[PDB]
């Protein structure tokens, strides 16, 4: 289409009007333009080519194959910065990727909380605020292979909220011990269980439990007695919220099997007073508690 100078003079710069006039006097209005399917001369988008883009066009004053300035008339005298910054926002960050501005600020508890929430539906806030994690066993194991000895880091950790909920987790990593602890912490939260506690301080009565080669003898204790038990049992009691306990481990004292045996004993070897009363159809009275009641 051929347009009158008035219209074309309201959209295009004066410097380009002469070129438009000459083109409208050399190309007949009835020109049937054909599309080339061998050579693509124009870009894949529409452009009047009246403005120089700061990025998609050559930089004015910069030397290059098609620079029209004389060699003594270039205007780039500083070379410490990139001449043509990226267009638009200034970045090419892929959709769904984040610029790594900050590194080393992650909390492994928050990483465990986010992953478990997505995988199991547990509340992240409870994991990151209510739970305490204590490593119990940290050793290196090795497998003999044809290539050679392959070492691995083994971590056994216990987590708990100090209010009845405790869990045991194990983790392995061939790379570093920190990765093994992360997996163990992850596993421990998934294994969280509630343990009955008498007066939220001790166990119900005494427990004689056999876990593989470990013989566990645990006795309930008076208020203010403290934890007088194997060190492995001490850590578990701390996380679980057991304050008063006495006990002795016989036969095997393997730390790993003491920890698992203890967790199992607290669940499979205890019976609440309420559960005993309902099963037998009898009333069970705590004499010490009644003595100080109204």
């Amino acid at each position: 289409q051929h347009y009158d100078e008035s219209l074309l003079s309201r959209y295009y710069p004066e410097s380009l009007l002469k070129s438009i006039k000459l083109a409208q006097q050399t190309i007949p209005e009835d020109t049937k333009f054909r599309v080339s399917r061998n050579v693509e001369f124009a870009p894949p988008y529409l452009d009047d080519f009246t403005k120089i883009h700061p990025f998609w066009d050559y930089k004015p004053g910069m030397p290059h194959l098609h620079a029209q300035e004389e060699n003594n008339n270039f205007s780039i005298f500083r070379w410490d910065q990139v001449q043509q910054p990226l267009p638009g926002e200034g970045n090419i960050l892929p959709p769904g990727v984040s610029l790594p501005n900050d590194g080393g600020r992650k909390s492994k508890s928050a990483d465990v909380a986010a992953g478990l929430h997505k995988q199991t539906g547990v509340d992240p806030d409870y994991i990151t605020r209510k739970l305490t994690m204590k490593p119990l066993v940290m050793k290196r194991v090795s497998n003999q292979t044809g290539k050679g000895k392959i070492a691995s880091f083994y971590a056994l950790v216990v987590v708990g909220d100090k209010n009845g909920m405790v869990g045991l987790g194990e983790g392995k990593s061939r790379e570093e011990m920190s990765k093994a602890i992360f997996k163990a912490h992850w596993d421990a939260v998934r294994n969280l269980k509630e343990i009955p506690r008498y007066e939220n301080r001790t166990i119900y009565g005494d427990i004689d439990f056999r876990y593989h080669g470990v013989k566990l003898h645990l006795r309930s204790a008076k208020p203010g007695f403290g934890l007088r038990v194997n060190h492995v049992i001490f850590e578990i009691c701390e996380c679980a919220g057991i304050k008063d306990l006495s006990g002795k481990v016989y036969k095997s004292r393997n730390d790993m099997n003491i920890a698992k045996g203890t967790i199992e004993a607290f669940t499979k070897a205890q019976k609440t007073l309420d559960e005993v009363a309902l099963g037998r159809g009898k009333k069970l009275v705590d004499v010490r508690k009644v003595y100080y009641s109204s």
Partner: peptide, 20 residues
């Protein structure tokens, strides 16, 4: 001697990183 005792120092060192 190397394998068994090397980790005693590293696994305690892992605990050093925990406080860090």
């Amino acid at each position: 001697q190397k394998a068994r005792k090397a980790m005693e120092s590293y696994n305690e060192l892992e605990d050093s990183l925990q406080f860090d």
